[PDB]
mmCIF file of C-alpha atoms in Angstrom:
data_model
loop_
_atom_site.group_PDB
_atom_site.id
_atom_site.type_symbol
_atom_site.label_atom_id
_atom_site.label_comp_id
_atom_site.label_asym_id
_atom_site.label_seq_id
_atom_site.Cartn_x
_atom_site.Cartn_y
_atom_site.Cartn_z
ATOM 1 C CA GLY A 1 -7.222 -11.126 0.876
ATOM 2 C CA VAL A 2 -3.759 -9.666 0.066
ATOM 3 C CA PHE A 3 -2.981 -6.264 0.797
ATOM 4 C CA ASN A 4 0.339 -4.578 0.040
ATOM 5 C CA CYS A 5 1.846 -1.372 1.062
ATOM 6 C CA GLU A 6 5.086 -0.221 -0.066
ATOM 7 C CA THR A 7 6.649 3.326 1.285
ATOM 8 C CA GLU A 8 9.657 5.186 1.190
ATOM 9 C CA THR A 9 11.444 6.840 4.062
ATOM 10 C CA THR A 10 14.306 9.320 3.937
ATOM 11 C CA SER A 11 17.539 8.987 6.009
ATOM 12 C CA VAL A 12 20.258 11.425 6.357
ATOM 13 C CA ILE A 13 22.611 8.143 7.269
ATOM 14 C CA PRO A 14 24.577 6.400 4.816
ATOM 15 C CA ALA A 15 23.489 3.258 3.499
ATOM 16 C CA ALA A 16 25.869 0.947 4.325
ATOM 17 C CA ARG A 17 26.028 2.543 7.970
ATOM 18 C CA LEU A 18 22.264 2.535 8.342
ATOM 19 C CA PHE A 19 22.112 -1.248 7.133
ATOM 20 C CA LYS A 20 24.779 -2.128 9.813
ATOM 21 C CA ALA A 21 22.783 -0.510 12.684
ATOM 22 C CA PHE A 22 19.357 -1.096 11.962
ATOM 23 C CA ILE A 23 19.137 -4.443 10.686
ATOM 24 C CA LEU A 24 22.427 -6.399 11.290
ATOM 25 C CA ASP A 25 22.776 -5.240 15.108
ATOM 26 C CA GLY A 26 18.924 -4.555 15.232
ATOM 27 C CA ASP A 27 18.368 -6.696 18.161
ATOM 28 C CA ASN A 28 20.838 -5.288 20.410
ATOM 29 C CA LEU A 29 20.415 -1.311 19.029
ATOM 30 C CA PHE A 30 16.559 -0.906 19.376
ATOM 31 C CA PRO A 31 16.374 -1.447 23.038
ATOM 32 C CA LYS A 32 19.451 0.602 23.691
ATOM 33 C CA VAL A 33 18.224 3.522 21.700
ATOM 34 C CA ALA A 34 14.339 2.988 22.189
ATOM 35 C CA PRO A 35 14.084 1.622 25.355
ATOM 36 C CA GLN A 36 10.759 3.248 25.635
ATOM 37 C CA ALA A 37 9.249 1.701 22.495
ATOM 38 C CA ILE A 38 11.112 -1.751 22.613
ATOM 39 C CA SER A 39 11.522 -3.732 25.908
ATOM 40 C CA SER A 40 13.780 -6.569 24.449
ATOM 41 C CA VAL A 41 14.543 -8.607 21.274
ATOM 42 C CA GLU A 42 15.240 -12.163 22.063
ATOM 43 C CA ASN A 43 15.621 -15.235 19.621
ATOM 44 C CA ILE A 44 13.404 -17.956 20.130
ATOM 45 C CA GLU A 45 15.072 -20.531 17.587
ATOM 46 C CA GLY A 46 18.182 -20.470 15.842
ATOM 47 C CA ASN A 47 21.179 -18.066 15.047
ATOM 48 C CA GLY A 48 19.938 -15.099 13.337
ATOM 49 C CA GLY A 49 20.095 -17.100 10.336
ATOM 50 C CA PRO A 50 17.276 -17.449 7.704
ATOM 51 C CA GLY A 51 14.446 -19.287 9.795
ATOM 52 C CA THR A 52 15.348 -17.744 12.993
ATOM 53 C CA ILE A 53 12.295 -16.791 14.933
ATOM 54 C CA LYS A 54 12.900 -13.877 16.818
ATOM 55 C CA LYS A 55 10.425 -12.354 19.913
ATOM 56 C CA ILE A 56 10.529 -8.594 20.267
ATOM 57 C CA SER A 57 8.952 -7.735 23.522
ATOM 58 C CA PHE A 58 7.165 -4.118 24.018
ATOM 59 C CA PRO A 59 6.696 -2.003 27.285
ATOM 60 C CA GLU A 60 3.154 -2.086 29.168
ATOM 61 C CA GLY A 61 0.909 0.078 27.903
ATOM 62 C CA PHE A 62 1.440 -0.248 24.316
ATOM 63 C CA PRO A 63 -1.341 -1.960 22.248
ATOM 64 C CA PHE A 64 0.625 -4.923 21.654
ATOM 65 C CA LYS A 65 2.339 -7.233 24.546
ATOM 66 C CA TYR A 66 4.851 -8.832 21.580
ATOM 67 C CA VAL A 67 5.529 -10.123 18.407
ATOM 68 C CA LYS A 68 7.304 -13.235 16.858
ATOM 69 C CA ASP A 69 9.446 -12.622 13.731
ATOM 70 C CA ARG A 70 10.979 -14.915 11.302
ATOM 71 C CA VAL A 71 14.184 -14.141 9.775
ATOM 72 C CA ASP A 72 13.775 -15.023 6.001
ATOM 73 C CA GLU A 73 16.871 -13.336 4.322
ATOM 74 C CA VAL A 74 19.364 -10.941 4.971
ATOM 75 C CA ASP A 75 21.054 -9.465 1.903
ATOM 76 C CA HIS A 76 24.218 -7.895 2.615
ATOM 77 C CA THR A 77 25.250 -6.841 -0.715
ATOM 78 C CA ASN A 78 21.845 -5.077 -1.464
ATOM 79 C CA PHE A 79 21.134 -4.231 2.254
ATOM 80 C CA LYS A 80 17.764 -6.265 1.991
ATOM 81 C CA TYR A 81 16.051 -7.370 5.135
ATOM 82 C CA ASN A 82 13.027 -10.237 4.214
ATOM 83 C CA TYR A 83 10.817 -11.332 7.557
ATOM 84 C CA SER A 84 7.399 -12.546 8.452
ATOM 85 C CA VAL A 85 5.258 -11.289 11.381
ATOM 86 C CA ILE A 86 3.939 -14.719 12.384
ATOM 87 C CA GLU A 87 2.898 -14.087 16.114
ATOM 88 C CA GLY A 88 1.327 -11.861 18.490
ATOM 89 C CA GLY A 89 1.196 -7.706 17.707
ATOM 90 C CA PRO A 90 -1.756 -7.746 15.097
ATOM 91 C CA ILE A 91 -1.964 -11.388 14.177
ATOM 92 C CA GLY A 92 -5.211 -12.569 15.168
ATOM 93 C CA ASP A 93 -8.645 -12.291 14.590
ATOM 94 C CA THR A 94 -8.646 -11.870 10.576
ATOM 95 C CA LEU A 95 -4.854 -11.215 10.017
ATOM 96 C CA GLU A 96 -2.804 -14.483 9.723
ATOM 97 C CA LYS A 97 0.585 -13.023 8.436
ATOM 98 C CA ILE A 98 2.812 -9.943 7.795
ATOM 99 C CA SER A 99 5.320 -10.572 5.060
ATOM 100 C CA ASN A 100 7.903 -7.720 5.030
ATOM 101 C CA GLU A 101 11.026 -6.214 2.973
ATOM 102 C CA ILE A 102 13.388 -3.360 4.022
ATOM 103 C CA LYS A 103 15.710 -2.326 1.467
ATOM 104 C CA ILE A 104 18.142 0.382 2.295
ATOM 105 C CA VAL A 105 19.196 2.072 -0.673
ATOM 106 C CA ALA A 106 21.921 4.838 -0.866
ATOM 107 C CA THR A 107 20.808 8.468 -2.483
ATOM 108 C CA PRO A 108 23.104 10.844 -4.466
ATOM 109 C CA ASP A 109 23.570 13.221 -1.191
ATOM 110 C CA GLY A 110 25.207 10.456 0.508
ATOM 111 C CA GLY A 111 22.081 9.474 2.668
ATOM 112 C CA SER A 112 19.771 6.368 2.090
ATOM 113 C CA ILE A 113 16.157 5.867 1.670
ATOM 114 C CA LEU A 114 14.102 3.147 3.294
ATOM 115 C CA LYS A 115 12.202 0.911 0.780
ATOM 116 C CA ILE A 116 9.691 -0.919 3.275
ATOM 117 C CA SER A 117 7.041 -3.143 1.728
ATOM 118 C CA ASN A 118 4.365 -4.605 4.085
ATOM 119 C CA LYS A 119 2.527 -7.722 2.537
ATOM 120 C CA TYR A 120 -0.589 -8.548 4.581
ATOM 121 C CA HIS A 121 -2.650 -12.123 4.625
ATOM 122 C CA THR A 122 -6.361 -11.237 5.708
ATOM 123 C CA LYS A 123 -9.056 -13.683 5.891
ATOM 124 C CA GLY A 124 -11.370 -14.109 2.914
ATOM 125 C CA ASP A 125 -13.290 -10.410 2.153
ATOM 126 C CA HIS A 126 -11.738 -8.631 5.320
ATOM 127 C CA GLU A 127 -9.501 -5.298 4.768
ATOM 128 C CA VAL A 128 -6.350 -4.612 7.111
ATOM 129 C CA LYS A 129 -7.572 -2.897 10.059
ATOM 130 C CA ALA A 130 -6.352 0.632 9.025
ATOM 131 C CA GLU A 131 -5.173 1.793 12.676
ATOM 132 C CA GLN A 132 -2.617 -1.130 12.876
ATOM 133 C CA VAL A 133 -1.093 0.048 9.562
ATOM 134 C CA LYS A 134 -0.778 3.764 10.896
ATOM 135 C CA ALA A 135 0.221 2.364 14.292
ATOM 136 C CA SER A 136 3.067 0.319 12.394
ATOM 137 C CA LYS A 137 3.855 3.481 10.305
ATOM 138 C CA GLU A 138 4.641 5.240 13.418
ATOM 139 C CA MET A 139 6.587 2.582 15.743
ATOM 140 C CA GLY A 140 9.085 2.205 12.521
ATOM 141 C CA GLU A 141 9.588 5.969 11.856
ATOM 142 C CA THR A 142 10.258 5.994 15.897
ATOM 143 C CA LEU A 143 12.844 2.990 15.802
ATOM 144 C CA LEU A 144 14.425 5.056 12.636
ATOM 145 C CA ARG A 145 15.081 8.625 14.242
ATOM 146 C CA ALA A 146 15.962 6.787 17.556
ATOM 147 C CA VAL A 147 18.358 4.917 15.598
ATOM 148 C CA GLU A 148 19.524 8.095 13.124
ATOM 149 C CA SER A 149 19.849 10.351 16.460
ATOM 150 C CA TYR A 150 21.908 7.790 17.922
ATOM 151 C CA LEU A 151 24.391 7.116 14.875
ATOM 152 C CA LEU A 152 24.667 10.974 14.792
ATOM 153 C CA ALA A 153 25.984 11.409 18.590
ATOM 154 C CA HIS A 154 28.405 7.968 18.102
ATOM 155 C CA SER A 155 30.686 8.605 14.702
ATOM 156 C CA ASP A 156 32.605 5.738 15.760
ATOM 157 C CA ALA A 157 29.182 3.210 16.107
ATOM 158 C CA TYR A 158 28.793 1.207 12.828
ATOM 159 C CA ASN A 159 32.176 2.553 11.106
ATOM 160 C CA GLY B 1 8.736 9.896 -3.115
ATOM 161 C CA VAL B 2 6.843 6.767 -4.496
ATOM 162 C CA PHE B 3 3.967 5.023 -2.299
ATOM 163 C CA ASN B 4 2.381 1.915 -4.052
ATOM 164 C CA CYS B 5 -0.931 0.490 -2.649
ATOM 165 C CA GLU B 6 -2.152 -2.939 -3.855
ATOM 166 C CA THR B 7 -5.586 -4.142 -2.514
ATOM 167 C CA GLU B 8 -8.109 -7.048 -3.321
ATOM 168 C CA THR B 9 -11.708 -6.454 -3.825
ATOM 169 C CA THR B 10 -14.306 -9.069 -4.281
ATOM 170 C CA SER B 11 -17.020 -9.242 -6.994
ATOM 171 C CA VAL B 12 -20.389 -11.290 -7.345
ATOM 172 C CA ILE B 13 -19.844 -10.567 -11.152
ATOM 173 C CA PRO B 14 -18.090 -13.137 -13.749
ATOM 174 C CA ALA B 15 -15.069 -11.334 -14.586
ATOM 175 C CA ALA B 16 -15.382 -10.712 -18.285
ATOM 176 C CA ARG B 17 -18.979 -8.978 -17.595
ATOM 177 C CA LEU B 18 -17.744 -6.747 -14.654
ATOM 178 C CA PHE B 19 -14.525 -6.099 -17.438
ATOM 179 C CA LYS B 20 -17.634 -4.930 -19.952
ATOM 180 C CA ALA B 21 -19.613 -3.098 -17.456
ATOM 181 C CA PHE B 22 -17.223 -1.456 -14.764
ATOM 182 C CA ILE B 23 -14.150 -0.770 -17.055
ATOM 183 C CA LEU B 24 -15.727 -0.897 -20.989
ATOM 184 C CA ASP B 25 -18.796 1.418 -20.184
ATOM 185 C CA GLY B 26 -18.046 2.873 -16.914
ATOM 186 C CA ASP B 27 -18.024 6.527 -18.673
ATOM 187 C CA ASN B 28 -21.530 5.768 -19.113
ATOM 188 C CA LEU B 29 -22.809 3.654 -16.627
ATOM 189 C CA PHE B 30 -21.132 5.798 -13.234
ATOM 190 C CA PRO B 31 -23.177 8.888 -13.406
ATOM 191 C CA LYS B 32 -26.307 6.638 -14.060
ATOM 192 C CA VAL B 33 -25.948 4.062 -11.231
ATOM 193 C CA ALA B 34 -24.060 6.625 -8.856
ATOM 194 C CA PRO B 35 -25.358 10.180 -9.326
ATOM 195 C CA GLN B 36 -24.502 10.420 -5.611
ATOM 196 C CA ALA B 37 -20.787 9.769 -6.197
ATOM 197 C CA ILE B 38 -19.961 10.605 -10.063
ATOM 198 C CA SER B 39 -21.869 13.607 -11.687
ATOM 199 C CA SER B 40 -20.422 13.199 -14.978
ATOM 200 C CA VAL B 41 -17.729 11.636 -16.965
ATOM 201 C CA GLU B 42 -16.280 13.486 -20.400
ATOM 202 C CA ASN B 43 -13.623 12.572 -23.003
ATOM 203 C CA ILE B 44 -11.572 16.000 -23.580
ATOM 204 C CA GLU B 45 -9.386 13.873 -25.873
ATOM 205 C CA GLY B 46 -9.971 10.240 -27.753
ATOM 206 C CA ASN B 47 -12.780 8.104 -26.867
ATOM 207 C CA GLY B 48 -11.819 5.361 -24.188
ATOM 208 C CA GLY B 49 -8.526 3.793 -25.396
ATOM 209 C CA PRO B 50 -5.000 4.635 -24.689
ATOM 210 C CA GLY B 51 -3.609 8.602 -24.559
ATOM 211 C CA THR B 52 -7.703 9.380 -23.777
ATOM 212 C CA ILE B 53 -8.156 12.418 -21.353
ATOM 213 C CA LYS B 54 -11.162 12.080 -19.586
ATOM 214 C CA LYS B 55 -12.746 14.893 -16.956
ATOM 215 C CA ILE B 56 -14.642 13.441 -14.064
ATOM 216 C CA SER B 57 -16.817 15.771 -12.454
ATOM 217 C CA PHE B 58 -18.173 15.178 -8.459
ATOM 218 C CA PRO B 59 -21.477 16.109 -6.885
ATOM 219 C CA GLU B 60 -21.275 19.092 -5.011
ATOM 220 C CA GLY B 61 -19.829 19.286 -1.422
ATOM 221 C CA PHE B 62 -17.227 16.633 -2.120
ATOM 222 C CA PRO B 63 -13.546 17.686 -1.011
ATOM 223 C CA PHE B 64 -12.926 17.972 -4.691
ATOM 224 C CA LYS B 65 -14.710 19.197 -7.976
ATOM 225 C CA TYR B 66 -13.333 16.938 -10.474
ATOM 226 C CA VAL B 67 -10.408 14.831 -11.642
ATOM 227 C CA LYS B 68 -8.408 14.138 -14.867
ATOM 228 C CA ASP B 69 -7.711 10.961 -15.631
ATOM 229 C CA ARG B 70 -5.429 9.834 -18.674
ATOM 230 C CA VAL B 71 -6.028 6.099 -19.660
ATOM 231 C CA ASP B 72 -2.905 4.369 -20.470
ATOM 232 C CA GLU B 73 -3.735 0.729 -21.163
ATOM 233 C CA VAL B 74 -6.961 -1.260 -21.818
ATOM 234 C CA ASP B 75 -6.448 -5.138 -22.140
ATOM 235 C CA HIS B 76 -9.983 -6.592 -23.599
ATOM 236 C CA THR B 77 -8.585 -10.358 -23.206
ATOM 237 C CA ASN B 78 -6.675 -10.258 -19.803
ATOM 238 C CA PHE B 79 -9.321 -7.726 -18.366
ATOM 239 C CA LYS B 80 -6.475 -4.822 -17.266
ATOM 240 C CA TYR B 81 -6.891 -1.100 -17.260
ATOM 241 C CA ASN B 82 -4.261 1.233 -16.906
ATOM 242 C CA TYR B 83 -5.034 4.760 -15.942
ATOM 243 C CA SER B 84 -3.329 7.842 -14.172
ATOM 244 C CA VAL B 85 -5.042 10.657 -12.151
ATOM 245 C CA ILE B 86 -2.948 13.566 -13.537
ATOM 246 C CA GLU B 87 -5.231 16.692 -12.469
ATOM 247 C CA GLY B 88 -7.637 17.859 -10.195
ATOM 248 C CA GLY B 89 -8.787 16.009 -7.222
ATOM 249 C CA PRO B 90 -5.815 14.931 -4.665
ATOM 250 C CA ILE B 91 -3.316 16.615 -7.353
ATOM 251 C CA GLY B 92 -1.822 19.472 -6.021
ATOM 252 C CA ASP B 93 0.473 20.757 -3.327
ATOM 253 C CA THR B 94 2.939 17.847 -2.568
ATOM 254 C CA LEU B 95 1.362 15.021 -5.037
ATOM 255 C CA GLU B 96 1.993 15.074 -8.748
ATOM 256 C CA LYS B 97 0.404 11.926 -10.038
ATOM 257 C CA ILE B 98 -1.405 8.910 -9.530
ATOM 258 C CA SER B 99 -0.619 5.611 -11.471
ATOM 259 C CA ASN B 100 -3.394 3.137 -11.447
ATOM 260 C CA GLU B 101 -3.389 -0.670 -12.227
ATOM 261 C CA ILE B 102 -6.347 -2.555 -12.303
ATOM 262 C CA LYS B 103 -6.720 -6.315 -13.291
ATOM 263 C CA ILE B 104 -10.240 -8.291 -12.771
ATOM 264 C CA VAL B 105 -9.749 -12.169 -12.317
ATOM 265 C CA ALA B 106 -11.954 -15.069 -12.467
ATOM 266 C CA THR B 107 -12.823 -17.125 -9.104
ATOM 267 C CA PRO B 108 -13.588 -20.928 -8.924
ATOM 268 C CA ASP B 109 -17.028 -19.949 -7.837
ATOM 269 C CA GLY B 110 -18.270 -17.818 -10.712
ATOM 270 C CA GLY B 111 -17.559 -14.660 -9.493
ATOM 271 C CA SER B 112 -14.094 -12.528 -9.454
ATOM 272 C CA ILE B 113 -11.546 -10.360 -7.808
ATOM 273 C CA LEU B 114 -10.715 -6.687 -8.877
ATOM 274 C CA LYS B 115 -6.639 -6.263 -8.172
ATOM 275 C CA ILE B 116 -6.096 -2.532 -7.947
ATOM 276 C CA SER B 117 -2.740 -1.028 -7.661
ATOM 277 C CA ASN B 118 -2.492 2.662 -7.014
ATOM 278 C CA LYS B 119 1.167 4.256 -7.555
ATOM 279 C CA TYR B 120 1.584 7.901 -5.904
ATOM 280 C CA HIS B 121 4.435 10.197 -6.950
ATOM 281 C CA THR B 122 4.580 12.494 -3.746
ATOM 282 C CA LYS B 123 7.114 15.533 -3.706
ATOM 283 C CA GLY B 124 10.659 14.571 -2.273
ATOM 284 C CA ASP B 125 10.117 13.723 1.966
ATOM 285 C CA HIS B 126 6.525 14.035 1.767
ATOM 286 C CA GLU B 127 4.267 11.082 2.636
ATOM 287 C CA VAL B 128 0.920 10.258 0.673
ATOM 288 C CA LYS B 129 -2.096 11.949 2.466
ATOM 289 C CA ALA B 130 -3.363 9.148 4.338
ATOM 290 C CA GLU B 131 -7.117 10.376 4.089
ATOM 291 C CA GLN B 132 -6.649 10.130 0.164
ATOM 292 C CA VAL B 133 -6.008 6.583 0.435
ATOM 293 C CA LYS B 134 -9.284 6.112 2.443
ATOM 294 C CA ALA B 135 -11.210 8.591 0.054
ATOM 295 C CA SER B 136 -9.983 6.663 -3.159
ATOM 296 C CA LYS B 137 -10.692 3.156 -1.810
ATOM 297 C CA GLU B 138 -14.264 4.520 -0.267
ATOM 298 C CA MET B 139 -14.902 5.697 -3.749
ATOM 299 C CA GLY B 140 -14.152 2.418 -5.508
ATOM 300 C CA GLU B 141 -16.013 0.361 -3.501
ATOM 301 C CA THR B 142 -19.027 2.453 -3.941
ATOM 302 C CA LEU B 143 -18.781 2.560 -7.512
ATOM 303 C CA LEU B 144 -18.362 -1.281 -7.683
ATOM 304 C CA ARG B 145 -21.313 -1.974 -5.170
ATOM 305 C CA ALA B 146 -23.628 0.406 -7.523
ATOM 306 C CA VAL B 147 -22.345 -1.494 -10.737
ATOM 307 C CA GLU B 148 -22.830 -4.908 -9.013
ATOM 308 C CA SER B 149 -26.505 -3.905 -7.990
ATOM 309 C CA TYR B 150 -27.376 -2.544 -11.556
ATOM 310 C CA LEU B 151 -25.960 -5.714 -13.117
ATOM 311 C CA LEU B 152 -28.053 -8.223 -10.767
ATOM 312 C CA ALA B 153 -31.216 -6.132 -11.449
ATOM 313 C CA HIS B 154 -30.352 -6.332 -15.252
ATOM 314 C CA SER B 155 -29.527 -9.945 -16.256
ATOM 315 C CA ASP B 156 -29.775 -8.797 -19.742
ATOM 316 C CA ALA B 157 -27.023 -6.008 -19.414
ATOM 317 C CA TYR B 158 -23.101 -6.706 -20.699
ATOM 318 C CA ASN B 159 -23.873 -10.301 -21.036
#
C-alpha cells in the first residue's frame, strides 16, 4: 500500500534563513543544536548532491540506532528538499521506503511554515505503524525547535 | 493550518459494484448493515448529488451525536465521491472542515482499492487531533467491512 501524510508546522524564523540552517547545513547543525537527539550525520556515498547517501546516527536509548537517507533533490529557489528513507529506522518488516518532501514557505508576518510530506510504501494490505508516524512527528518537531532556538540566540548565524 | 491524510484500502468487491453499494446507496445500506456504527442518514437538502447536505446520526455512547456532510461531486464513470464534513462530530474548537475525496479503482484480481484523501482545515498553528484520524479510519474500515459482508451474502444486490 501507499500512505501519504502532509503536515504544516509554523516557525518564527524567516524562510530563507531557515532553509540555509535546517536544510542546507543540517548535517552540521543538527548534531550541534540537538546532540541529545542526533549523534552524527555522515556521507556514505556522494557529496551532498542528488543521489548522495547519508547516515544519521541516534544516541543509545532511542528506538532506532540509525537511518540512511538518499538525497533526491535540493531546490534553492523554492526552498524544497526531497529525500528518501531507505535503510534503518522504521525500514523493515512491512515498510520498504519513506519518500519525503520538506518545503519551507515564507508567511506574511515574516516567519515561515514547513510543509512536509511523508509517503510510506508498505507491504500489500499492511498499514503504517502509527507509533512510528507519531515518533517521526516528535523527532522532527524537536529538531526544528532546537534549530529555531539556536538561530534566535545567534543573529549572525545563517545571515 | 492544513493537514492531508491519503490512504489505500483493499476490497474484494469489484469497483463498479462497490461504488453502487458503498457510495451510491450508502444512505440506505449503512444503518441496515452497520447499526452499531451508523443510526441514520437523512438528506437535509437534495437527494444525494452535488450540493446535498446529509445528517448522519451515530449510536448512543459514540463520542459524537451526528455529523453534517455536504456532497461536493459524484463521478459515476470514474467512481469518484467528494464530500465535506461541515458540522457536528469533530467540527468545532480548532477544526473548521474536513474535505474528503474517495476514488475506487479496479485491481487485476477482480477486486478494488479505495483511495481516500482527508484534508483538515485547522485553526492557525493547531494540529489535527490524532484521535480524530484514528476514529475516521476505524469508522471507514467498519463500514466497508459491513458492506462487503452484505454484498458477499447477497450476490444479486447491486450487480
